[PDB]
Amino acid sequence: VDCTMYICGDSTECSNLLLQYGSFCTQLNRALTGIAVEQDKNTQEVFAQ
Amino acid sequence: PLSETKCTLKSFTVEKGIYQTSNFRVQPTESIVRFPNITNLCPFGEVFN
Numbered sequence A: 001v002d003c004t005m006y007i008c009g010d011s012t013e014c015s016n017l018l019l020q021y022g023s024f025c026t027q028l029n030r031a032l033t034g035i036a037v038e039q040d041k042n043t044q045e046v047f048a049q
Numbered sequence B: 001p002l003s004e005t006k007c008t009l010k011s012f013t014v015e016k017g018i019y020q021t022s023n024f025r026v027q028p029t030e031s032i033v034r035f036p037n038i039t040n041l042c043p044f045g046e047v048f049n
């Protein structure tokens, strides 16, 4: 997920207001990346044997 | 791109791998405004002319 876009992208004014919350969604872009990585690890653990 | 990686990771050195540093978006080139077809031009001229 692109949280900038999810909340409201392609808008100067939305970005300026998203930023008043700091890392509020940055941490979720991070959490989702971690989940997707874990899903590739699961595939490898099960099939690349 | 390597400096994108270094500031994203808050590091002056980078380990082997892939890191997400940004989000790519194409912006509009032109604006399309289409209002419904007008056949019904208003007869103001019948009073003015």
Ligand SMILES: *[C@@H]1O[C@H](CO)[C@@H](O)[C@H](O)[C@H]1NC(C)=O
Pocket: B045, B048, B049
């Ligand atoms: C009458 O029609 C003409 C077309 O040549 C237009 O230029 C003009 O605005 C009209 N006259 C008035 C008073 O609206």
